[PDB]
Design a protein that fits this description.
Keywords (chain B): DNA-binding
Protein name (chain B): TetR/AcrR family transcriptional regulator
Number of strands of chain A: 0
CATH architecture of chain A: Orthogonal Bundle
Oligomer: homodimer
Pfam family, one (chain B): TetR_N
CATH topology of chain A: Tetracycline Repressor, domain 2
Helix content of chain A: 55-70%
Largest interface: A-B, 48 and 47 residues
CATH superfamily of chain A: Tetracycline Repressor, domain 2
GO molecular function (chain B): DNA binding
Organism (chain B): Acinetobacter baumannii
Number of domains of chain A: 1
CATH class of chain A: Mainly Alpha
Order of helices and strands of chain A: HHHHHHHHH
Largest sheet of chain A: none
Number of helices of chain A: 9
Shape of chain A: elongated
Chain lengths: ~180, ~180
C-alpha cells in the first residue's frame, strides 16, 4: 500500500542526486514509513533500484507511445517530429538531471535483473527510432546516428550547460520537413 | 612524480570502477605513497578528483590534437574523419568504460572545482567539432547534432550492447564524402 510512496520518493532522490549517494535511511524518512514497512515491499536496496528503473521505463514508454498513437492518422514525419519534440520537453522539465538508465550504468548498478531492464528499455528506444525513420518520407541521416544524438542530449546539463539541445533539435526537424 | 604517482593510480582506479566506489585510503595503498604526502597534494577527495579530471582532459585533448596536426597538410574532410575515427578507437580499447566526465557528473560530483574542469573540456570539444565542420567542404547535420552523437557514443557499452557505433560512424563518414 505504502509501496508507491516509497517508490516515488526514491525515484526523485535517485534522479535528483544518484543511486550510491542516497542511502536507504534517507529514503525511509522522506517516505514517512517505518523501517519494517520499507523492507516488506523492498527487501533490499537493489530490489528498490530494480523497481525504480522498471517504473522509469513504464512511464517513458507509455508517454512516448501515447503521443504517437495520437498521430496514427498524421503520417510518418509528424510521428518522428513528436518523438523529437518529446525530448525537448524532457530535458526542459524542472527536475531533469539526465537519463536514469545511463546513471545506473555509470554507477555500476548493474546486477543482472537491473541490467536487463536497462538494456531492454534502450533496445526498445533504438527499435522505435529505427521504425520511425525507415519510412519513405525519410532519408542522409541514419537512425543509429539519431539514436546516439538523442542519448547524448539526455546528459545532465551540468556536463556542458551552454549547449542548447532544443536549438539543435528544432534545426533537425526542419531538415525532415524539406 | 610523487603527485603524479597518485594521479595515475587514482585516475586508473576511478575509470575501472567509479569515483564513489574507490576510497581515498585504497588510493593511498596502491600508490605506496605516505599518507601525509597524499594530503599535501590533495587535502580532499574532491581536489584529487578535480586533478584526475584535469589529467584526463589533458590526455584526451593532446591525443585528439596530435592526430589533427599530423593531418595539417590534408583536407578538412580527412581531419573531421580523424576526429570521428578517434572515437571509434577510443571506445574499442580494452580498458574502455565510458566517458570519465559523464561518469563524474552522473555520480553527483557537482562541486565548483569538478564542474569547471568538466565543462571547460566539453566546451573545448564542442568548439572543435564546430570548427572541423565549419568548412566549405561540409550538410543537413549540424555540429551540435554531431557533438551530441559523439557524446552518446561514449556511453558504457552494456547500456545497450546491440548498438554498433563503429558502423554508425562509417556511414556518417560516408555521408561527408570520404
Amino acid at each position: 500500500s505504502k509501496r508507491k510512496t516509497i517508490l516515488d520518493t526514491a525515484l526523485s532522490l535517485f534522479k535528483q542526486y544518484s543511486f550510491k549517494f542516497v542511502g536507504v535511511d534517507r529514503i525511509i524518512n522522506e517516505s514517512q514509513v517505518a523501517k519494517m514497512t520499507f523492507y516488506k515491499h523492498f527487501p533490499s536496496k537493489t530490489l528498490l533500484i530494480q523497481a525504480c528503473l522498471c517504473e522509469e521505463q513504464k512511464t517513458i514508454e507509455e508517454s512516448i507511445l501515447n503521443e504517437l498513437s495520437l498521430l496514427s492518422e498524421a503520417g510518418n514525419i509528424a510521428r518522428l517530429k513528436a518523438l523529437l519534440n518529446w525530448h525537448v520537453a524532457y530535458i526542459n522539465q524542472q527536475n531533469f538531471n539526465g537519463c536514469l538508465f545511463q546513471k545506473a550504468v555509470y554507477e555500476n548498478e548493474v546486477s543482472e535483473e537491473v541490467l536487463s531492464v536497462i538494456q531492454a528499455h534502450k533496445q526498445w528506444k533504438f527499435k522505435l527510432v529505427s521504425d520511425l525513420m525507415e519510412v519513405p518520407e525519410c532519408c542522409f541521416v541514419s537512425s543509429s546516428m539519431v539514436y546516439s544524438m538523442l542519448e547524448g542530449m539526455l546528459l545532465p546539463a551540468n556536463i556542458n550547460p551552454c549547449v542548447d539541445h532544443e536549438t539543435a533539435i528544432k534545426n533537425l526537424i526542419q531538415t525532415f520537413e524539406a
